[PDB]
Design a binder for this molecule. Structure first.
Ligand SMILES: Cc1cc2nc3c(=O)[nH]c(=O)nc-3n(C[C@H](O)[C@H](O)[C@H](O)COP(=O)(O)O)c2cc1C
Ligand SMILES: Cc1cc2nc3c(=O)[nH]c(=O)nc-3n(C[C@H](O)[C@H](O)[C@H](O)COP(=O)(O)O)c2cc1C
Lengths: 104, 103
């Protein structure tokens, strides 16, 4: 019910810079293993890239979106991910972060 | 999905991040919120014994869950089920707290 991450689109490859304990438990990764990496590590071969394209379009356009996609825990167990994404911009109107909430 | 991040390495443990849900719940804008300690949500009917629990939990750097009166920007009373969680790095350094607000 409380699974979320913050990413930094200002750093190369838009890596995760924060994850809740819920996200860690959901995905089986530790904070050490996750931070500094783009969340795409949760994807795998059975993930539909057309569905990821919607995420891509939202990030480019810098707008919120919500999509369902196949995701893999560290061990390769699949987990339910209804992903909600939201951009955050600073006072000068420049994109600052994205936050993402994983519903399961 | 109402949540905030604070930075306890910064003076008075101020909010450095707030979700849109938190903004809508409290009626504040992000500009009005960042750099401030979350206590501005408190007011006259906020149980001071409950604030002491949050106080001790932050002191000991442990997670906690409490229920207390908060006030929106317009002064509107609301009950806040607040969940706090500290985050530290691999070298043991306390880095953030995150909090999640249920109303
Ligand atoms: C805040 C945020 C959270 C994200 N969470 C997930 C996630 O939980 N699972 C996932 O498969 N992709 C997630 N993504 C998507 C990837 O990070 C990336 O945007 C997507 O794979 C498209 O980028 P790419 O084409 O370079 O791989 C998230 C993206 C952002 C910005
Ligand atoms: C991450 C985080 C989120 C918090 N959210 C709230 C909140 O939503 N409402 C509230 O009344 N206090 C909240 N607090 C508690 C206050 O910031 C403060 O710690 C509390 O009032 C006790 O400190 P004080 O005695 O110095 O005021 C939060 C604290 C942290 C660390």
């Amino acid at each position: 019910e409380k699974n979320f991450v913050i990413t930094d689109p200002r750093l190369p490859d838009n890596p995760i810079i924060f994850a809740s304990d819920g996200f860690l438990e959901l995905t089986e990764y530790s904070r050490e293993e996750i931070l500094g990496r783009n969340a795409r590590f949760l994807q795998g071969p059975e993930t539909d890239q057309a569905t990821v394209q919607k995420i891509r379009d939202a990030i480019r356009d810098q707008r919120e979106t919500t999509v369902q996609l196949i995701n893999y825990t560290k061990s390769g167990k699949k987990f339910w991910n209804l992903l909600h994404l939201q951009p955050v911009r600073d006072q000068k109107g420049e994109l600052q972060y994205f936050y993402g909430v994983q519903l399961d």
